[PDB]
Design an enzyme around this catalytic site. Structure first.
Site, PDB file in Angstrom:
ATOM      1  N   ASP A 130      20.881  15.909  18.449  1.00 31.93           N
ATOM      2  CA  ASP A 130      19.942  16.516  17.502  1.00 31.93           C
ATOM      3  C   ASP A 130      18.503  16.475  18.024  1.00 31.93           C
ATOM      4  O   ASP A 130      17.583  16.008  17.347  1.00 31.93           O
ATOM      5  CB  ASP A 130      20.028  15.839  16.131  1.00 31.93           C
ATOM      6  CG  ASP A 130      19.345  16.656  15.033  1.00 31.93           C
ATOM      7  OD1 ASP A 130      19.000  17.834  15.283  1.00 31.93           O
ATOM      8  OD2 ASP A 130      19.153  16.125  13.918  1.00 31.93           O
ATOM      9  N   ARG A 134      11.080  17.586  15.201  1.00 32.44           N
ATOM     10  CA  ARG A 134      11.099  16.755  13.995  1.00 32.44           C
ATOM     11  C   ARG A 134      11.625  15.341  14.281  1.00 32.44           C
ATOM     12  O   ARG A 134      11.363  14.411  13.521  1.00 32.44           O
ATOM     13  CB  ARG A 134      11.942  17.417  12.894  1.00 32.44           C
ATOM     14  CG  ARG A 134      13.373  17.752  13.320  1.00 32.44           C
ATOM     15  CD  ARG A 134      14.216  18.367  12.189  1.00 32.44           C
ATOM     16  NE  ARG A 134      15.567  18.660  12.667  1.00 32.44           N
ATOM     17  CZ  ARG A 134      15.928  19.801  13.249  1.00 32.44           C
ATOM     18  NH1 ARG A 134      15.046  20.785  13.408  1.00 32.44           N
ATOM     19  NH2 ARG A 134      17.175  19.961  13.673  1.00 32.44           N
ATOM     20  N   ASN A 135      12.349  15.185  15.387  1.00 31.83           N
ATOM     21  CA  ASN A 135      12.961  13.905  15.738  1.00 31.83           C
ATOM     22  C   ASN A 135      12.296  13.222  16.931  1.00 31.83           C
ATOM     23  O   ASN A 135      12.894  12.360  17.569  1.00 31.83           O
ATOM     24  CB  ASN A 135      14.457  14.095  16.015  1.00 31.83           C
ATOM     25  CG  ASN A 135      15.241  14.416  14.756  1.00 31.83           C
ATOM     26  OD1 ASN A 135      14.902  13.948  13.669  1.00 31.83           O
ATOM     27  ND2 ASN A 135      16.288  15.226  14.893  1.00 31.83           N
ATOM     28  N   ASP A 148      16.397   7.594  18.330  1.00 29.91           N
ATOM     29  CA  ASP A 148      17.741   7.491  18.899  1.00 29.91           C
ATOM     30  C   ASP A 148      18.774   6.790  18.007  1.00 29.91           C
ATOM     31  O   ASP A 148      19.562   5.976  18.487  1.00 29.91           O
ATOM     32  CB  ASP A 148      17.671   6.781  20.257  1.00 29.91           C
ATOM     33  CG  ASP A 148      17.097   5.377  20.163  1.00 29.91           C
ATOM     34  OD1 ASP A 148      16.500   5.030  19.122  1.00 29.91           O
ATOM     35  OD2 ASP A 148      17.238   4.619  21.144  1.00 29.91           O
TER      36      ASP A 148
END
Length: 267
Positions: A130, A134-135, A148
């Site tokens: 993903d 945003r991450n 993670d």
């Protein structure tokens, strides 16, 4: 394990967001240190799953991946404690910044950092699944780290088949994943290309206005996003290389990181 903490070693200070759980800004009392704390909401995500996320994070050690500090696994509620990043997620950061400060050389620096993290996961037989702005998290002086919590073990490079009924973030997802639920380090490379496009546009939404249920059909016929305003030609060529239809034609993360390191050091 050595990682186990007593629950009373931490005190919660502020709520940052939620959900499958909540994230708090807290304090590790003996060290007077501000930390981040992820909790498990009961009952959303299954417990053994959460615990395995922690187990995997124990083996991770890299300057651009969020560092685990400790866990609470003896009794509910369960905690995962990590380092705290001051400036939140990279998407909102790019959208709200002073562009005279966050300029071209800074964008290159950010890409170099992220690709360094992905080269590390590539060598250690992990996939992310993903990758998106945003991450990613931001600290002082444009430091960037990848979150993670969702890492999976997978030999480089085999294939992981996702569970039946799973829903994907369509505009970041590789064609083989969309059609057959198949994921590998090469689908992480595809998603990285989309992240580079997010960085070049200071956080615009990808494939603007395009209906989700037609995305796959466009990719089949060799449609790709156009070169963004102000984006260097070599960087766009890298993007397009990340988006090759055949997974084995896409470059490795070691090559990508080499290229960005050279561009950064030459600017």
């Amino acid at each position: 394990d050595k990682w186990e903490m007593e629950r009373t070693d931490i005190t919660m200070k502020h709520k940052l967001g939620g959900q499958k759980g909540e994230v708090y800004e807290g304090v590790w009392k003996k060290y007077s240190l501000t930390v981040a704390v992820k909790t498990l909401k009961e009952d959303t995500m299954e417990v053994e799953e959460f615990l395995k996320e922690a187990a995997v994070m124990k083996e991770i050690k890299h300057p651009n991946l969020v560092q685990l500090l400790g866990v609470c696994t003896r009794e509910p509620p369960f905690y995962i404690i990590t380092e705290f990043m001051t400036y939140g997620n990279l998407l909102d950061y790019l959208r709200e910044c002073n562009r005279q400060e966050v300029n071209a050389v800074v964008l290159l620096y950010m890409a170099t950092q992220i690709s360094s993290a992905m080269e590390y996961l590539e060598k250690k037989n992990f996939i992310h699944r993903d990758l998106a702005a945003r991450n990613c998290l931001v600290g002082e002086n444009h430091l960037v780290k990848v979150a993670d919590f969702g890492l999976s073990r997978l030999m480089t490079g085999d294939t992981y088949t996702a569970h039946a009924g799973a829903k994907f973030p369509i505009k970041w997802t590789a064609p083989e994943s969309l059609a057959y639920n198949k994921f590998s380090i090469k689908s992480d490379v595809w998603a990285f290309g989309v992240l580079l496009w997010e960085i070049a546009t200071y956080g615009m939404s990808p494939y603007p206005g395009i209906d989700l249920s037609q995305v796959y059909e466009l990719l089949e016929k060799d449609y790709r996003m156009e070169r963004p305003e102000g984006c260097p030609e070599k960087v766009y060529e890298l993007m397009r290389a990340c988006w090759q239809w055949n997974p084995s034609d896409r470059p490795s993360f070691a090559e990508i990181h080499q290229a960005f390191e050279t561009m950064f050091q030459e600017s």
